[PDB]
Each structure stands twice: as C-alpha cells, then as structure tokens.
Amino acid sequence: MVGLIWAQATSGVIGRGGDIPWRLPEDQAHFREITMGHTIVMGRRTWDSLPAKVRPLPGRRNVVLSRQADFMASGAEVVGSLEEALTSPETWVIGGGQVYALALPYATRCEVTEVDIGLPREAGDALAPVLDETWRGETGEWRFSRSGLRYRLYSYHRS
Ligand SMILES: Nc1ncnc2c1ncn2[C@@H]1O[C@H](COP(=O)(O)OP(=O)(O)O)[C@@H](O)[C@H]1OP(=O)(O)O
Ligand SMILES: COc1cc(Cc2cnc(N)nc2N)cc(OC)c1OC
C-alpha cells in the first residue's frame, strides 16, 4: 500500500524558504499517528534538512531516495530508484515536492492536512501534488488548533 502524507495551505503551498510556513502541533501529532510502525520514504534533500537528533524518524523504517551512491544516512536505507523504495507492506511518502510527484502514480491513499491560511503561491514555494477525479473519501470537519489556526484532514483512497 503506497500512501502520501502532506500538509498544505488552501492554495497548495507546502513549503516556503524550505519551511512549512505555519505552526500546527496538532498536524505533527497526526503525522506521527499515520506513519508510526510503517515505512516512510523521503527525498535526500528532505533528509539533509532535518536536525541530526530528529532523523531517522523513530519507530518507522526510514528510506531515503538519492542519486549519490556514497550518501550516508545514519539509521536509514538509501535507494537509487522509486521502485525499490516501495516494497514494504505499507509505505508513506513524506516529502518533498519532487518525491511526491514521482510517487503519486503509485499511491492508493492520501492523508492531507489542509490549513485554512491564505498564502498565495509565490516564487520559490513548494507545491502539493494535485488530487484528480480518481480519488474518493472523507474531507473531515474544520477544527481550530490551540492557537486558533483552522485545519481539516482529508483521507482519500483509490484502486
Ligand atoms: N527517481 C529518483 N531516484 C533517486 N533519487 C531521487 C529520485 N528523485 C529524486 N531523488 C532524490 O531526492 C532529492 C529530492 O529530494 P526532495 O524531494 O526531498 O527535494 P525537494 O524538496 O527540493 O522537492 C533529489 O535531489 C535526489 O537526491 P540527490 O540530490 O541526493 O541525488
Ligand atoms: C521529513 O520528515 C518530516 C516531514 C514532515 C512534513 C509533514 C508535515 N505534516 C504532514 N501532515 N505531512 C508531512 N509529510 C513532518 C515531520 O515531522 C512532523 C517529519 O519528521 C521530521
């Protein structure tokens, strides 16, 4: 089962200056809940951006996609193609924009957080993959986070 998991603003922005452009602890909790115990796949640039004490993500099999054959990813495996990244019983692709594009055609689930923040797309932004007409499932009710930022969860699926 190949899933994608991401958080986006309503406009589709998922990154600005290499950062998620909001603060949402409750989305961090949701991300852990969906991924824990499973394989996670990320691009090398995403791995390299993480603080040393936060990688590998604990409790999950970490897979890093790279074209650098000598890359050292302490506590993870490094694969040189997407095919080899998707052989576990359940895999969550966790970023970045490049790897989400690559994996989209293979995915049969998406777990999306939509953040109700009016960030128009700007030069340099990273953008979410586009969900086409093949997907179905639940668009959850809006909730206020503890700070007052509104968010809701999509749980979509397809054959
Ligand atoms: N088909 C593929 N096979 C192998 N590695 C790939 C790949 N597509 C993407 N990548 C890797 O994933 C990196 C992209 O990571 P990312 O998706 O986290 O980045 P971005 O956040 O900038 O979209 C690529 O630069 C490449 O890693 P290297 O720079 O180390 O070579
Ligand atoms: C690459 O590692 C991480 C990536 C993210 C981005 C992310 C954040 N929120 C959601 N819903 N999905 C995502 N993929 C969130 C993370 O922790 C909350 C990660 O662990 C360090």
The DSSP 8-state label assigned to residue 126 in this structure reads E
Domains of the chain, by residue range, sit at 1-159
Residue 122 has a CB neighbour count (10 Å cut-off) of 10
Could you say which of 2.60.120.620, 3.40.430.10, 2.40.10.120, 3.20.20.70 is the CATH number of the domain covering 1-159? 3.40.430.10
Q: How far apart are the first and last CA of the chain?
A: 10
Q: What are phi and psi of 48, to 5 degrees?
A: -60, -25
Is 60 a known ligand-binding residue? Answer: yes
Ligand nearest to the CA of 153: 2
Tell me how far the alpha carbon of residue 67 is from its chain's centroid: 20
Identify the experimental approach.
X-ray
Residue 37 has a CB neighbour count (10 Å cut-off) of 8
Is 7 close to ligand 2, i.e. is its CB under 6 Å away?
yes
Give the ligand 2 atom nearest the CA of 112.
11
Instruction: List CB contacts of 4: < 8 A, sequence separation 6 or more.
Output: 92, 93, 100, 103, 104, 107, 109, 110, 111, 129
User: What is the Cα–Cα distance from 43 to 145, expressed in whole angstroms?
Assistant: 29
DSSP states of 77-109 = EEESSHHHHT-SSSEEE---HHHHHHHGGG-SE
Is 62 close to ligand 2, i.e. is its CB under 6 Å away?
no
Resolution (A): 1.4
Give the ligand 2 atom nearest the CA of 30.
11
Classify strands 126-127 and 91-93 as parallel, antiparallel or unpaired.
unpaired
